[PDB]
Amino acid sequence: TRVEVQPPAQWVLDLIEASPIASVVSDPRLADNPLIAINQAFTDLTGYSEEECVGRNCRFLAGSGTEPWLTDKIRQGVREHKPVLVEILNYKKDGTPFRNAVLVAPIYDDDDELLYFLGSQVEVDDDQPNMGMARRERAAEMLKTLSPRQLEVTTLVASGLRNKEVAARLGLSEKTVKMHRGLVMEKLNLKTSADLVRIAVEAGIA
Ligand SMILES: Cc1cc2nc3c(=O)[nH]c(=O)nc-3n(C[C@H](O)[C@H](O)[C@H](O)COP(=O)(O)O)c2cc1C
Ligand SMILES: [Cl-]
Ligand SMILES: [Cl-]
Ligand SMILES: [Mg+2]
Ligand SMILES: [Mg+2]
Ligand SMILES: [Mg+2]
DSSP, X not given: OOOOOOOOOHHHHHHHTTOSSEEEEEOTXXXXXXXXXXXXXXXXXHOOOHHHHTTSXXXXXXXXTOOHHHHHXXXXXXXXXXXEEXXXXXXXXXXXXXXEEEEEEEEEOTTSOSEEEEEEEEEXXXXXXXXXXXXXXXXXXXXXXXXXXXXXXXXXXXXXXXXXXXHHHHXXXXXXXXXXXXXXXXXXXXXXXXXXXXXXXXXXXX
């Protein structure tokens, strides 16, 4: 099955379009928390077009060998509004199995009002199946270059707090939080918020 989805708003596109990583957004108020947008990298990773994905829950990538003890951790993150990174067996449109390092994280619309989920998928090769640990090592090194306030804002954003919540936690304005976020993105060459949440969760700071 599949539901018809409203074209994505600009903030949805801003979350994923410039990520070099397969990135998606879902809307949990729609039937079966379906995908409402995918980037180009997601089509290149999986072979599915945007028309084939949007309106469906992302578990269409699952197949015979997919680990329910790992997908349950995603289910838990979605229910608790917390980020989860697991490495699960998935299947491309042509039936090619691949190990998917998938991040599912809470994210907010550009008014900091309603909750959505972002998804970030990286292929782990059968060749180099410990690639996950190499991405963790890189992430940890990058985050150690951040100033203390930048690290604090990064941690709380990646933990799933909206900017208004980060602002309340640190005694700042939303504007000041958005400024610190932008400087982290510029310093670490991160294209989108999905890319920022991913290095935070890879490192284990969220
Ligand atoms: C934004 C987002 C991205 C997701 N990406 C994937 C993915 O790449 N592969 C996949 O198998 N599951 C993915 N999922 C997980 C499924 O949608 C689902 O949450 C998970 O399998 C647990 O739910 P279930 O027990 O009903 O399957 C994603 C979920 C969301 C919300
Ligand atoms: Cl879901
Ligand atoms: Cl301030
Ligand atoms: Mg596109
Ligand atoms: Mg299941
Ligand atoms: Mg709005």
